[PDB]
Design a binder for this molecule. Structure first.
Ligand code: K0X
Ligand code: CL
Ligand code: CL
Ligand code: CL
Length: 258
């Protein structure tokens, strides 16, 4: 119970809603006297039982220090647990991807940059997988852009992102995350398309059971599509690890000009 992970509610000031569960901007008064801009995620919970069993991961998650993994700053209570995260003015990668297809928004994202996004995420997931942390919700909307434009994975602790074995059952290995990473790669390569156009979410298990997979995008290198298709092999054992994927993508990026 020695959890120097909780933060006194009084050190926290809450502002506008950034998204809806419900996410609000905030200011965190830090221990050096300065205030930090934060994002505050309201985790609506069932307090029939036990609020606890929730400060467990958060204390492990606070021990995470990888630049491609969002940092947990701590948790506050109002009984309303609030998860305190850094604020990233550039927002989530999915939206950045769409914006980039509008004038005024980011310029067309070249492939090198798109791949560097996939490497960041692969690096972040590799860190988490080496500490046997499952994500269970990986998608471009839950990846965030840091002020230096490196990507970090977030919302650790959806139908079209769920591996096929996890639809029949509801079990999740890290190889189920690998599958979602492959979908996320497709999200990135398509500059934000929704997965499986023409297929409804109710059609998805039968779609996948008959071995249909996400189609290859128009400009996507054959080599990148092979990497992403490997994430969807029917046997989780045939899928690569995140450490294999991360090096594959790093190599392909290096095999491209600047
Ligand atoms: N709802 C989904 C995805 C989006 C998460 C909510 N958005 C933000 N949160 C973050 N910080 C900045 C933003 C933001 O929206 N930046 C734009 C802005 C510019 C300028 C400005 F003035 C205000 C906001 N950190 C928390 C990240 C992860 C929390 C939940 C996981 N992901 C979700 O649950
Ligand atoms: Cl407040
Ligand atoms: Cl689209
Ligand atoms: Cl498709």
């Amino acid at each position: 119970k020695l959890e120097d992970v909780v933060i006194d509610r009084n050190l926290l000031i809450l502002g506008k809603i950034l998204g809806e569960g419900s996410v609000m901007e905030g200011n965190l008064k830090q221990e050096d006297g300065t205030s930090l801009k934060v994002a505050v995620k309201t985790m609506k919970l069932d307090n029939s039982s036990q609020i606890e069993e929730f400060l467990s991961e958060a204390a492990c998650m606070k021990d995470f220090s990888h630049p491609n993994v969002i940092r947990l700053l701590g948790v506050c209570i109002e009984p309303k647990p609030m998860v305190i995260l850094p604020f990233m003015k550039y927002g989530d990668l999915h939206t950045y991807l769409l914006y980039s297809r509008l004038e005024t928004g980011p310029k067309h994202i070249p492939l090198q940059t798109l791949l560097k996004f996939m490497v960041d995420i692969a690096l972040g997931m590799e860190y988490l997988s080496n500490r046997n942390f499952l994500h269970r919700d990986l998608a471009a909307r839950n990846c965030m852009l840091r002020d230096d434009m490196t990507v970090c994975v977030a919302d650790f602790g959806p139908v079209k992102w769920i591996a096929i074995e996890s639809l029949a059952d509801r079990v999740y290995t890290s190889k189920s995350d690998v599958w979602a990473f492959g979908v996320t790669m497709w999200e990135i390569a398509t500059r934000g398309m929704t997965p499986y156009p023409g297929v409804q979410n109710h059609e998805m298990y039968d779609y996948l059971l008959h071995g249909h997979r996400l189609k290859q995008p128009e400009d996507c290198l054959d080599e990148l599509y092979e990497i992403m298709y490997s994430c969807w092999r029917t046997d989780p054992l045939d899928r690569p690890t995140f450490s294999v994927l991360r090096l594959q993508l790093e190599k392909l990026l290096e095999s491209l000009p600047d």
